[PDB]
Amino acid sequence: NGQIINTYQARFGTIIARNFDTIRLSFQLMRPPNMTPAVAALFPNAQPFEHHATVGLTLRIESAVCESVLADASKTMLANVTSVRQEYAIPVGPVFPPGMNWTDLITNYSPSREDNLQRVFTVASIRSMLV
Amino acid sequence: EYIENWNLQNRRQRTGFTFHKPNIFPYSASFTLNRSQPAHDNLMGTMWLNAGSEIQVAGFDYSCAINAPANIQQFEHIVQLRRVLTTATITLLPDAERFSFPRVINSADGATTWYFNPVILRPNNVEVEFLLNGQIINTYQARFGTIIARNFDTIRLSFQLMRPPNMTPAVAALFPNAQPFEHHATVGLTLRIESAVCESVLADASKTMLANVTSVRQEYAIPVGPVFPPGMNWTDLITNYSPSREDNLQRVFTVASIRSMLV
Amino acid sequence: EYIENWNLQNRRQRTGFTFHKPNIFPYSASFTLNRSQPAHDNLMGTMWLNAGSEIQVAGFDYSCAINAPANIQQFEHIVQLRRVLTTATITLLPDAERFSFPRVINSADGATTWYFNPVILRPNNVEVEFLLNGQIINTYQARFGTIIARNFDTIRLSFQLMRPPNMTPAVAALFPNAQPFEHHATVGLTLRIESAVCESVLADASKTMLANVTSVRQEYAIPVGPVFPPGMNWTDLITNYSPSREDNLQRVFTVASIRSMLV
Amino acid sequence: QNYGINLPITGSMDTAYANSTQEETFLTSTLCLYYPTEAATEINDNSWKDTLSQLFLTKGWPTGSVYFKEYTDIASFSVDPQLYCDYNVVLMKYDATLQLDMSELADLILNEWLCNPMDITLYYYQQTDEANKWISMGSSCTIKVCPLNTQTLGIGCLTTDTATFEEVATAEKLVITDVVDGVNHKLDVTTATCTIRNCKKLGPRENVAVIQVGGSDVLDITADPTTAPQTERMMRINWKKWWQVFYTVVDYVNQIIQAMSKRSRSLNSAAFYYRI
Amino acid sequence: QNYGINLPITGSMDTAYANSTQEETFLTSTLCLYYPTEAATEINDNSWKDTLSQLFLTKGWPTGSVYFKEYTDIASFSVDPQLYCDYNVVLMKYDATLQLDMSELADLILNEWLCNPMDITLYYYQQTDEANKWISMGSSCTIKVCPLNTQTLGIGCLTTDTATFEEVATAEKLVITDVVDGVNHKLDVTTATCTIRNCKKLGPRENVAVIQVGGSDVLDITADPTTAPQTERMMRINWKKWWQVFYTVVDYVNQIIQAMSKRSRSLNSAAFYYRI
Amino acid sequence: QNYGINLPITGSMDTAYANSTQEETFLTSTLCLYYPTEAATEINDNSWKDTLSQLFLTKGWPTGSVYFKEYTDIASFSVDPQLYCDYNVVLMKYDATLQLDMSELADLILNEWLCNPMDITLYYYQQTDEANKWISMGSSCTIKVCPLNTQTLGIGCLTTDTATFEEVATAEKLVITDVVDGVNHKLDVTTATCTIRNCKKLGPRENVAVIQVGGSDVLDITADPTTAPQTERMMRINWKKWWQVFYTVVDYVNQIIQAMSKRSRSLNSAAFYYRI
Amino acid sequence: QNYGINLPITGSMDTAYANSTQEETFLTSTLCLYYPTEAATEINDNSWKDTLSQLFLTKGWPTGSVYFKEYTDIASFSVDPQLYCDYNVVLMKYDATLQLDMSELADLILNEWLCNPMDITLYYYQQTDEANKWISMGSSCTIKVCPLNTQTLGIGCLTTDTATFEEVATAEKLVITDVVDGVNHKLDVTTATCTIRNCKKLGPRENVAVIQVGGSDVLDITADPTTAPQTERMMRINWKKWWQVFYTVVDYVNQIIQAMSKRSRSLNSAAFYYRI
Ligand SMILES: *[C@@H]1O[C@H](CO)[C@@H](O)[C@H](O)[C@H]1NC(C)=O
Ligand SMILES: *[C@@H]1O[C@H](CO)[C@@H](O)[C@H](O)[C@H]1NC(C)=O
Ligand SMILES: *[C@@H]1O[C@H](CO)[C@@H](O)[C@H](O)[C@H]1NC(C)=O
Ligand SMILES: *[C@@H]1O[C@H](CO)[C@@H](O)[C@H](O)[C@H]1NC(C)=O
Ligand SMILES: [Ca+2]
Ligand SMILES: [Ca+2]
Ligand SMILES: [Ca+2]
Ligand SMILES: [Ca+2]
Ligand SMILES: [Ca+2]
Ligand SMILES: [Ca+2]
Ligand SMILES: [Ca+2]
Ligand SMILES: [Ca+2]
Ligand SMILES: [Ca+2]
Ligand SMILES: [Ca+2]
Ligand SMILES: [Ca+2]
Ligand SMILES: [Ca+2]
Ligand SMILES: [Ca+2]
Ligand SMILES: [Ca+2]
Ligand SMILES: [Ca+2]
Ligand SMILES: [Ca+2]
Ligand SMILES: [Zn+2]
Ligand SMILES: [Zn+2]
Ligand SMILES: [Zn+2]
């Protein structure tokens, strides 16, 4: 909600975010003040620029806890609901996006969609006990 | 109504608060310039006031679409409601009276001021779309007066400034082929939510719960807390209407309605 | 509500009538010229409409504060309410659409007519003060949208016409250094009371008590009495809201609410 | 009754309109026509003033209310013009060679000017603001100016040597000088045949109208280059005969007076502001 | 139509615009270009009419729609001008000496006029309203006016002795006389040379546009000194050669016609409606 | 930073006006004054430039920022004038005989023209839209045009005989030619003496203002007959002494610069739009 | 555009490609081929321009789009080169004795430059940044440099005696001078014969491509000794005849234009942006 809960500076590896809804990754491309002849050759003082400096970060959420249902790499609730909807040619309804596409569903994860999705995921978990 | 909605929500059934003129839009008098330059004498863009239950929007072109493809300039205005509204009665009127008089407006960065000299043309190809999750729930084309938006969280007003193909000499005198453009063609739209239903609590024109809470906090000099903005400013509150803010607001509004029964 | 207030009043307890758009301002479309001359070409002053629950005020300067002490022209409007209002929700908007188009206006004595050609500038240093017994109860500086006035009987709207320090060539063309002044710089303010609470009875946009009393009096050709204006006219009644008038009006409004239960 | 103070006046936006006061204004006011001598020459009629008075009487002006004042030409008339009637109309013939002279004349009579004396011998003079000008009138005005600096020494001029002064007027009957504001100037003026006054432009002179008889719109009553306002009191007519011009003036006198208002400075309300 | 002229016409402010009617207007209208003889002289070409017609065809006017009418000068063209087709464009060369004659011609052809005969030999005449004028034209007009009084006695002019009348025109090919209203006037006119009619200005004329070639804004199509309206049909251009002028007229013919309106062409080509 | 892409701007009201930037602009910008030679001749002083620089320094302009460029006359100045200062003010003397040339010069310097080359020997040329003109400049431009038809045959002219062409310019030092759009024209121009270019009017040039010294409003910077716009950058002043002209220019430099804007095209943002 | 220049532009990496715009680019652009005089001499044909235009039309360029400009030699073309149209292809004949002159011309016309006047007769000058150079051109440039110290005293050169200055150019039609930064320099230049400007290299110029006819890779468009970039706009071909060169240019015009970018053309054809 706009308040910094966790902050990690120059840390890499495993980190813990205890409670959050926003991620802010700030980094910098610093020109190396001391360059060997090849490095200095890569970066001229003016155009043309043939080699382009890039600084990257990778963030991977391995585990989390959410008050709402979500698709994840381990469970099969989304797969089961989508499979059932596809196998019986269920026409698109007024709640979920066509084909149960996860990107559209999570882009506009509204309270009504949350209620319907929790309902169907709970039913799918019930069904997976037997089928 | 408030205690009934409290009990229904504690049971997680639909709760519905009915609002006359719901205070759903935070105040914002803003403009967008799609075509501009430092002299601000050949401008194309939009200016709007979104305030309370009301939205006045106006698309202006200084050239009057002289060089626009097919002599039509398309304007769009998207307003995202912070909460989903249902069973909403809307009055849509062709013109926006607020942006139809001469006006000296500030620059976007405040460095200078530009001039606006509207001449109002009827909006063309008006389409009011009421969207839910990006899907068109209601669509109204060239329809004005009372309309019903049954369930929506976004409003899309698309309207066109169409250059009159045939002009009388007095009209033709206003829109030359090139600059200077003394008269600037403006199309408008006014959208007023007379009544609606929301699952969340909102300020509205008929109820006094926001007024009661604000009065109680001001009278006893309650220090600003970690939830609400200072002075319970409704614009700030509705702009960032977070779930925690919604819970606290519902609590205090229910308490205020309880207090109103006696005080 | 009306019988509750009647019984509370008979015991001398705090009474409360809740009004949606209370009709508290007697109708008045007036102007004040702080600077004027026989030809009415260099005018500084204010024009306002106070109607029902609405106040539209506009300060105009024909010279656009060119010779003002700091290129600031200060305008002030004081509205004294005939009764104290509490728990009031108020929409405040920058512009006054009613005084933003060309007008031909009678002189104060009706001897001649002058010309008004507004160009609307953004009001500067807007300070809305809600006063009780001459003391400042609520203050809102540069705040627009919905505001709360918890307890007040007077409204003081102070605003300023500030000459833009930087002008584009068109804007600079509108405002010369000396006369003639063809475009007259106008700043505005709109103030709507959406809802309020008053210890006294008032006509509003939701209840039908005034309409019922007036209709009964007109249907049976009741001769004018010694208490009410000779049409049951609301402007005269609210202008001179005496204690005797208030007592009689509460009586008749309570009886009208009783009648409306059956008729 | 309360003369030295500016008290606000409140009016209701719905009171009424009083009846037309044009007839009473014509009955109780005076009209002055200013025209060049060549107009009288071309008319070549001894009783033409009487005929014009009769025609004005047909328009509601009582006999003797309308006066006709002759002037030789624009330049001569520009020497301290005195417009004393309630309503003044000046027929000014257009000369393409005298555009600035006509502009200065109109600026002098179409505006209100508050003038203080100038003693160029004793003092150095600035112009404080945009409304400050130096108006000089006489049989022949020749104004030369030396702009000083913060040390009182001339810029491109020597205070002692007038030969280096920068001439801004030469044998003018009337000239309005505008110099850079905030800069002290030493002035050399032909005081024998010309008086110079430090004047402030208060505002329009409501009761003076100038009808330009002839060419296109050339008057510039504003010293500012960016603006050349054409007020309703700056009329312009095309002509070939002076009798036609005077008949037009008489026939449309209602419109001409309508374009004019009573001099705000000439009524009791102006008392103790500057004059009456 | 006449029976329903005094009937309301109600329209909705949401009725879809019709398509452009410019093409249909050109395909069914006729255009007249009035130019002075000096234009054709300076062009010095005999097929230029065909070239202009072909250029107009490129601009959408079918062959045969555009007509070219020549006039010697402003004075000669003012003798009962004839406007022949749906759209009339008059190229008027500017001259600083004939400002009033240009104004008179523009007033005559840019407005509707309702004229009646004036038997100046028999009756005295009045101009009842501001819209009433006396338009006289022919080989040479010399109008002398003697205002009268309630007893028919002339004011500043003996009725019998025309030599004492007041001269308003001399050898004019066209003149619009405007005398004081409500006063009977005796008129002496060169009836053998030119005719005078009592005319009323009905309103503007939409099918006639005047393009002033060179000069400044000098036309005054209203006798009122306070007003010098510059309508959309009064264009002005700068020129060094006439071919550029004609190419400008052809290239911007759409704009010129836009400034003009249909239904303004009367059945006859005259410059006024005559009632005898 | 993001050049070549038009990004919408979404400013708001109530952002509060910033303080005056006039002082900062005067401090950081340069001003060029363009005046005729006769101005310096009449002034007749060898330090007048220094005095005007000092007077401008009194108005806020740092010393060395105001430049004084001289031109012989309008014709010579119309030979591809290069206005390079941040703000350019051109003091242009009025001549009744050079109205079109004055208009052409103003149109060339008061507007922005994207010009591409013209090789009349190799190709035929047409003006596609109303913003397309042919601008020719040099010692002497004589342009003759032969309109062609769809059969690439001259209309009223023979493609092989230039004597039958139509003359649109003669001995001009600057001329703007507007021909009928959508028609191919063969061109005969004195290429050895002057150069022609196909130029599109993009829009106003804001850093250039023209002060017409004396005269009336005669400029027409638009080829449209129906439009004669007097923008805020076209001042007119009545004059007798050039010293008064320069004092007026310096004293109202605030107003003059307010009427102008930084050249929208000559700044970092226009990078990859046309320049910089 | 300008107000939103400092705004982000966001793009999805899955947005479908638009169709080829090459056809539209050719149908709306203009191409200039700059070739030496020896090329036209060796071709020895008077209609070769028509043939090349027709071949370009076969390649998609509408007739009139392609232009051919001749220059005598590298030296003459370097005197204020003018780049006229949207796409400029410069055929530069290689000469082993003029490597630096070719490099200077390529640097001038392949990069954007922002230049200011240098009053070398009054002030000493510095090159503040590596992007700052001094570009001088004209009939004959001879630049002598005297580096100064903190006390203005020249280093290895007396300030008064120019003969002891340091020669950096001799009779050059164009030279780009690069002195040590942070050191004030006194300059002696043949101002009567050639002009010198203080210039800053803004960046590359996309609308200008240079094809080196014959030779080797010798251009060095950057002053830095460590960098000799060979951009996509610096082509090189081998030749025995000029017709083969022109056919190669026509046949691979698509590839040449691909190496160039739109929007780099400036209103003016100048090789730099001048600020005074
Ligand atoms: C004003 O005009 C009216 C209408 O003609 C007339 O009856 C009345 O007497 C006039 N005078 C006054 C003082 O109202
Ligand atoms: C008007 O134009 C439209 C659009 O080209 C076309 O469909 C229609 O047929 C035209 N005519 C009418 C009478 O609408
Ligand atoms: C702006 O002007 C005000 C008053 O003129 C002054 O106090 C202030 O310091 C100035 N600067 C800023 C950044 O507001
Ligand atoms: C692009 O090319 C495709 C394929 O030929 C064609 O269908 C389409 O109309 C072209 N134009 C656009 C704007 O996509
Ligand atoms: Ca001197
Ligand atoms: Ca004078
Ligand atoms: Ca001054
Ligand atoms: Ca002026
Ligand atoms: Ca005549
Ligand atoms: Ca007589
Ligand atoms: Ca009359
Ligand atoms: Ca008139
Ligand atoms: Ca010319
Ligand atoms: Ca021919
Ligand atoms: Ca054209
Ligand atoms: Ca024009
Ligand atoms: Ca060299
Ligand atoms: Ca040495
Ligand atoms: Ca260096
Ligand atoms: Ca290098
Ligand atoms: Zn802006
Ligand atoms: Zn008044
Ligand atoms: Zn309501």
Swiss-Prot record, chain A:
Q: Give a short account of its post-translational modification.
A: The N-terminus is blocked.
Gene Ontology biological-process annotations: fusion of virus membrane with host plasma membrane
Q: Which cysteine pairs are joined by S-S bonds?
A: none
Identify the main location: virion
**From what superkingdom does this record's organism come?**
Viruses
Annotated keywords = Calcium, Capsid protein, Intermediate capsid protein, Metal-binding, Ubl conjugation, Virion, Zinc
Reproduce the miscellaneous comment text. The VP6 trimer contains a zinc ion located at the center of the molecule. The zinc ion is not essential for either trimerization or transcription activity of the DLP. Zinc-depleted VP6 has an increased sensitivity to proteases.
Q: How does it assemble?
A: Homotrimer. Interacts with the inner capsid protein VP2. Interacts with the outer capsid glycoprotein VP7. Interacts with the outer capsid protein VP5*.
**What protein am I looking at?**
Intermediate capsid protein VP6
Q: Which residues of the full protein are shown?
A: 266 to 396 of 397
From Swiss-Prot, chains D, E, F, G:
Question: Which keywords label this protein?
Answer: Calcium, Capsid protein, Disulfide bond, Glycoprotein, Host endoplasmic reticulum, Host-virus interaction, Metal-binding, Outer capsid protein, Signal, T=13 icosahedral capsid protein, Virion
- UniProt PTM: N-glycosylated. The N-terminus is blocked possibly by pyroglutamic acid.
In residue numbers, the region (GPR motif) covers: 203-205
Disulfide links within the chain? C32-C85, C115-C199, C141-C194, C146-C157
Q: Looking at the keywords, is Disulfide bond present? A: yes
List of glycosylated residues: N19
Q: Record-annotated residues binding Ca(2+) 2?
A: Q127, D178, V179, D181, D251
**What is the purpose of this protein?**
Calcium-binding protein that interacts with rotavirus cell receptors once the initial attachment by VP4 has been achieved. Rotavirus attachment and entry into the host cell probably involves multiple sequential contacts between the outer capsid proteins VP4 and VP7, and the cell receptors. Following entry into the host cell, low intracellular or intravesicular Ca(2+) concentration probably causes the calcium-stabilized VP7 trimers to dissociate from the virion. This step is probably necessary for the membrane-disrupting entry step and the release of VP4, which is locked onto the virion by VP7.
- What is stated as this protein's family in its record? Belongs to the rotavirus VP7 family.
Q: How does it assemble?
A: Homotrimer; disulfide-linked. 2 Ca(2+) ions bound at each subunit interface in the trimer hold the trimer together. Interacts with the intermediate capsid protein VP6. Interacts with the outer capsid protein VP5*. Interacts with host integrin heterodimer ITGAV/ITGB3.
The molecule here is called Outer capsid glycoprotein VP7
Question: Which residues of the whole protein does the chain here span?
Answer: 51 to 326 of 326
